[PDB]
Enzyme design. Structure first.
Site, mmCIF file in Angstrom:
data_model
loop_
_atom_site.group_PDB
_atom_site.id
_atom_site.type_symbol
_atom_site.label_atom_id
_atom_site.label_comp_id
_atom_site.label_asym_id
_atom_site.label_seq_id
_atom_site.Cartn_x
_atom_site.Cartn_y
_atom_site.Cartn_z
ATOM 1 N N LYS A 1 0.809 -1.255 0.000
ATOM 2 C CA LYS A 1 0.000 0.000 0.000
ATOM 3 C C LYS A 1 0.828 1.285 0.000
ATOM 4 O O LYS A 1 0.419 2.301 -0.536
ATOM 5 C CB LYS A 1 -0.952 0.027 1.181
ATOM 6 C CG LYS A 1 -2.090 -1.022 1.116
ATOM 7 C CD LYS A 1 -2.891 -0.953 2.461
ATOM 8 C CE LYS A 1 -3.859 -2.119 2.638
ATOM 9 N NZ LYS A 1 -4.705 -2.003 3.910
ATOM 10 N N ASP B 1 -9.393 2.754 3.342
ATOM 11 C CA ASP B 1 -9.140 2.137 4.633
ATOM 12 C C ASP B 1 -9.466 3.150 5.749
ATOM 13 O O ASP B 1 -10.000 2.798 6.805
ATOM 14 C CB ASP B 1 -7.659 1.761 4.747
ATOM 15 C CG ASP B 1 -7.294 0.428 4.067
ATOM 16 O OD1 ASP B 1 -8.154 -0.477 3.905
ATOM 17 O OD2 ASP B 1 -6.087 0.237 3.821
HETATM 18 N N1 NDP Z 1 -10.115 -5.123 8.352
HETATM 19 C C1 NDP Z 1 -9.629 -5.478 7.298
HETATM 20 O O1 NDP Z 1 -10.206 -6.412 6.551
HETATM 21 C C2 NDP Z 1 -8.290 -4.950 6.874
HETATM 22 C C3 NDP Z 1 -7.155 -5.387 7.540
HETATM 23 N N2 NDP Z 1 -5.871 -4.868 7.281
HETATM 24 C C4 NDP Z 1 -4.863 -5.898 7.561
HETATM 25 O O2 NDP Z 1 -3.820 -5.275 8.308
HETATM 26 C C5 NDP Z 1 -2.623 -6.019 8.114
HETATM 27 C C6 NDP Z 1 -1.523 -5.064 7.694
HETATM 28 O O3 NDP Z 1 -1.662 -4.720 6.313
HETATM 29 P P1 NDP Z 1 -0.663 -3.631 5.676
HETATM 30 O O4 NDP Z 1 -0.515 -2.506 6.680
HETATM 31 O O5 NDP Z 1 -1.091 -3.348 4.242
HETATM 32 O O6 NDP Z 1 0.736 -4.449 5.631
HETATM 33 P P2 NDP Z 1 2.222 -3.811 5.527
HETATM 34 O O7 NDP Z 1 3.101 -4.887 4.943
HETATM 35 O O8 NDP Z 1 2.188 -2.496 4.809
HETATM 36 O O9 NDP Z 1 2.642 -3.583 7.074
HETATM 37 C C7 NDP Z 1 2.588 -4.651 8.020
HETATM 38 C C8 NDP Z 1 3.156 -4.178 9.350
HETATM 39 O O10 NDP Z 1 3.141 -5.254 10.272
HETATM 40 C C9 NDP Z 1 4.430 -5.349 10.882
HETATM 41 N N3 NDP Z 1 4.701 -6.722 11.331
HETATM 42 C C10 NDP Z 1 4.726 -7.825 10.563
HETATM 43 N N4 NDP Z 1 5.017 -8.885 11.347
HETATM 44 C C11 NDP Z 1 5.165 -8.421 12.605
HETATM 45 C C12 NDP Z 1 5.480 -9.027 13.806
HETATM 46 N N5 NDP Z 1 5.640 -10.374 13.866
HETATM 47 N N6 NDP Z 1 5.535 -8.271 14.913
HETATM 48 C C13 NDP Z 1 5.321 -6.945 14.876
HETATM 49 N N7 NDP Z 1 5.067 -6.327 13.719
HETATM 50 C C14 NDP Z 1 4.941 -7.058 12.589
HETATM 51 C C15 NDP Z 1 5.399 -4.889 9.822
HETATM 52 O O11 NDP Z 1 6.608 -4.453 10.434
HETATM 53 P P3 NDP Z 1 8.054 -4.664 9.717
HETATM 54 O O12 NDP Z 1 8.140 -3.527 8.730
HETATM 55 O O13 NDP Z 1 8.950 -4.621 10.936
HETATM 56 O O14 NDP Z 1 8.039 -5.997 9.003
HETATM 57 C C16 NDP Z 1 4.603 -3.733 9.236
HETATM 58 O O15 NDP Z 1 4.637 -2.610 10.110
HETATM 59 C C17 NDP Z 1 -2.943 -7.064 7.062
HETATM 60 O O16 NDP Z 1 -3.289 -8.258 7.768
HETATM 61 C C18 NDP Z 1 -4.187 -6.553 6.372
HETATM 62 O O17 NDP Z 1 -4.971 -7.634 5.866
HETATM 63 C C19 NDP Z 1 -5.746 -4.188 6.059
HETATM 64 C C20 NDP Z 1 -6.877 -3.715 5.397
HETATM 65 C C21 NDP Z 1 -8.154 -4.130 5.768
HETATM 66 O O1 SKM Z 2 -8.015 -8.533 2.160
HETATM 67 C C1 SKM Z 2 -8.351 -7.702 1.285
HETATM 68 O O2 SKM Z 2 -8.897 -8.054 0.203
HETATM 69 C C2 SKM Z 2 -8.049 -6.287 1.527
HETATM 70 C C3 SKM Z 2 -7.729 -5.894 2.768
HETATM 71 C C4 SKM Z 2 -7.386 -4.448 3.104
HETATM 72 O O3 SKM Z 2 -5.965 -4.328 3.117
HETATM 73 C C5 SKM Z 2 -7.924 -3.486 2.056
HETATM 74 O O4 SKM Z 2 -7.320 -2.213 2.211
HETATM 75 C C6 SKM Z 2 -7.583 -3.972 0.661
HETATM 76 O O5 SKM Z 2 -8.084 -3.042 -0.301
HETATM 77 C C7 SKM Z 2 -8.272 -5.309 0.404
#
Ligand code: NDP
Ligand code: SKM
Length: 259
Positions: free
Chosen positions: A69, A105
Site C-alpha cells: 500500500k 481504509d
Molecule cells: N479489516 C480489514 O479487513 C483490513 C485489515 N488490514 C490488515 O492489516 C494487516 C496489515 O496490512 P498492511 O498494513 O497493508 O501491511 P504492511 O506490509 O504495509 O505492514 C505490516 C506491518 O506489520 C508489521 N509486522 C509484521 N510482522 C510483525 C510481527 N511479527 N511483529 C510486529 N510487527 C509485525 C510490519 O513491520 P516490519 O516492517 O517490521 O516488518 C509492518 O509494520 C494485514 O493483515 C491486512 O490484511 C488491512 C486492510 C483491511
Molecule cells: O483482504 C483484502 O482483500 C483487503 C484488505 C485491506 O488491506 C484493504 O485495504 C484492501 O483493499 C483489500
C-alpha cells in the site's frame, strides 16, 4: 456490453475475500454499470512494480493489500482524496488514461468503529491510514513497532512513537501488523495481557479466523473486534470509486455484507 478487468494485489493473497464481495456487486449492478466486471486475486512478487502490472494486465481498477500500500502511493500518476494524507494507497482506478490512487481504509475503519486514546501496533499501510483517521477524530495516538523505519510520517501527524512498550493504559489497542495472517503475536504475550486488562477494545485488522492477538483478548474477557466490518466498508467505498462514483457505497455495502 464490454468486459472490464479488476483485482486485488497482495502477497500472500489467497486469504482475500475481496473477489467474492466485489464480483457479487459487478453482477448485481451490471445494467447500471453498463459493463461486465470481474475481479481477480493477483499474487504479486515482492519485487514487481504495481503500476507496470496494472497496465500489463489491462485492469480498469484494483485494490492493494499487504505489503504494497505504501508502494502503491509512490507509483501512482495522481493521488486523490484522503490518501494524500495517508501515505498509502489501497484503491487504484484508471482515469483519463492515468493510474489514480485513493485510500478507503481510513473511512472504512471510521465506519467500522462504533474512546480517547489509541495504541497502534504496526507502521505499514494500514497503520498509516488508521493513525491519520484517529488523529482527525481528536484521539491521542501512540504507535509501537518492531522497527524504526517509516516513522517520520507518524511523528509529523503528532503521534507518540515507540519501540519499547509504554507503560500506560490505552482505550483502543489495534493490531495493524501482518503478524496475524502469518499467524504470530504482534508483541510479547505478557505486555499484551497488561494492555488488554486496562483497554476497552482490542481491534485486529485481520478477518476470517481467530488470530493469536484476538484469542488472547477473548481469553481475558476484553471486548474485541476483527477486521470484517472494515473489510466490507472499504470494499464498498472502493467499488464506488471503481464505478466512477456511479454506485453509492451504501448500496454496495448491503450486497457485500450479505454474501
Ligand atoms: N479489516 C480489514 O479487513 C483490513 C485489515 N488490514 C490488515 O492489516 C494487516 C496489515 O496490512 P498492511 O498494513 O497493508 O501491511 P504492511 O506490509 O504495509 O505492514 C505490516 C506491518 O506489520 C508489521 N509486522 C509484521 N510482522 C510483525 C510481527 N511479527 N511483529 C510486529 N510487527 C509485525 C510490519 O513491520 P516490519 O516492517 O517490521 O516488518 C509492518 O509494520 C494485514 O493483515 C491486512 O490484511 C488491512 C486492510 C483491511
Ligand atoms: O483482504 C483484502 O482483500 C483487503 C484488505 C485491506 O488491506 C484493504 O485495504 C484492501 O483493499 C483489500
Amino acid at each position: 456490453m464490454k468486459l472490464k478487468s479488476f483485482g486485488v494485489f497482495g502477497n500472500p493473497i489467497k486469504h482475500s475475500k475481496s473477489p467474492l464481495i466485489h464480483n457479487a456487486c459487478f453482477l448485481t449492478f451490471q445494467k447500471e454499470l453498463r459493463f461486465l466486471g470481474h475481479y481477480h486475486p493477483i499474487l504479486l512478487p515482492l519485487e514487481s512494480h504495481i503500476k507496470s502490472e496494472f497496465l500489463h494486465l489491462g485492469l480498469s481498477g484494483a485494490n492493494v493489500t499487504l505489503p504494497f500500500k505504501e508502494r502503491a502511493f509512490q507509483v501512482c500518476d495522481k493521488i486523490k482524496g484522503i490518501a494524500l494524507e495517508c501515505g498509502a494507497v489501497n484503491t487504484l482506478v484508471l482515469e483519463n488514461d492515468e493510474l489514480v490512487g485513493y485510500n478507503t481504509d481510513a473511512l472504512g475503519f471510521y465506519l467500522s468503529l462504533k474512546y480517547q486514546n489509541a495504541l497502534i501496533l504496526g507502521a505499514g499501510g494500514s497503520a498509516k491510514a488508521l493513525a491519520c483517521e484517529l488523529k482527525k477524530q481528536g484521539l491521542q495516538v501512540s504507535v509501537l513497532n518492531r522497527s524504526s523505519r517509516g516513522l517520520d510520517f507518524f511523528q509529523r501527524l503528532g503521534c507518540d512513537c515507540f519501540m519499547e512498550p509504554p507503560k500506560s493504559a490505552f482505550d483502543l489497542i489495534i493490531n495493524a501488523t501482518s503478524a496475524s495472517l502469518h499467524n504470530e503475536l504482534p508483541l510479547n504475550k505478557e505486555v499484551l495481557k497488561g494492555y488488554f486488562k486496562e483497554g476497552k477494545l482490542a481491534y485486529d485488522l485481520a478477518y476470517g479466523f481467530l488470530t493469536p492477538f484476538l484469542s488472547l483478548a477473548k481469553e481475558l474477557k476484553t471486548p474485541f473486534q476483527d477486521g470484517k466490518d472494515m473489510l466490507i466498508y472499504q470494499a464498498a467505498l472502493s467499488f464506488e470509486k471503481f464505478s466512477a462514483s456511479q454506485i453509492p457505497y451504501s448500496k454496495a455495502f448491503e450486497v457485500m455484507r450479505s454474501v
